[PDB]
Amino acid sequence: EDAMTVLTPLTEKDYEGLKRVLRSLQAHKMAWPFLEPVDPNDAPDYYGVIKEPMDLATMEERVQRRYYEKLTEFVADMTKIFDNCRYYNPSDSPFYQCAEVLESFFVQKLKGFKASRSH
């Protein structure tokens, strides 16, 4: 990550961009596994093996409350969603597949956000 990402405090204009990025991911066809916290009734062992769970509704709550002070912190929460999924699930599962697709989409949108910040 460059100078600006780590170091620049997030402004109110930055927050309008982050809201737009998050809504784009929530609208993606392969975001369904990540929209809400993992239901433990679907996997009674999940919260024993994943120590820092994350999901897009938790991220939306945090954006609304202005939790994030730097872009790096927002990126770290988003990356946790995809890394948790690839550690819990095998590489041939549809959940793993969805993480691969959605992370590539996030990277495209994040590059767009960074470009709009700089000019």
Ligand X SMILES: Nc1nonc1N1CCCCC1
In the range 71-90, which residues lie near ligand X by CB under 6 A? Answer: 85, 88-89
- Torsions phi, psi of 66, nearest 5? 60, 40
Q: How far is the CB of 92 from ligand X (least distance, A)?
A: 14
Vertex 12 angle, CA 64 and 115, to 5° = 110
Q: x/- string (CB under 6 A) for ligand X, residues 20-49? A: -------------xx---x---xx--x---
* Contact between residue 68 and residue 10 where contact means Cβ atoms under 8 Å apart: yes
Contact criterion met (CB below 8 Å) for 54 and 67: no
Instruction: Name the residue nearer to ligand X (CB basis): 5 or 89.
Output: 89
State the DSSP code for 70.
B
Closer residue to ligand X, CB minimum distance, 63 or 85: 85
Give residues in contact with ligand X (CB under 6 A): 33-34, 38, 42-43, 46, 85, 88-89, 95
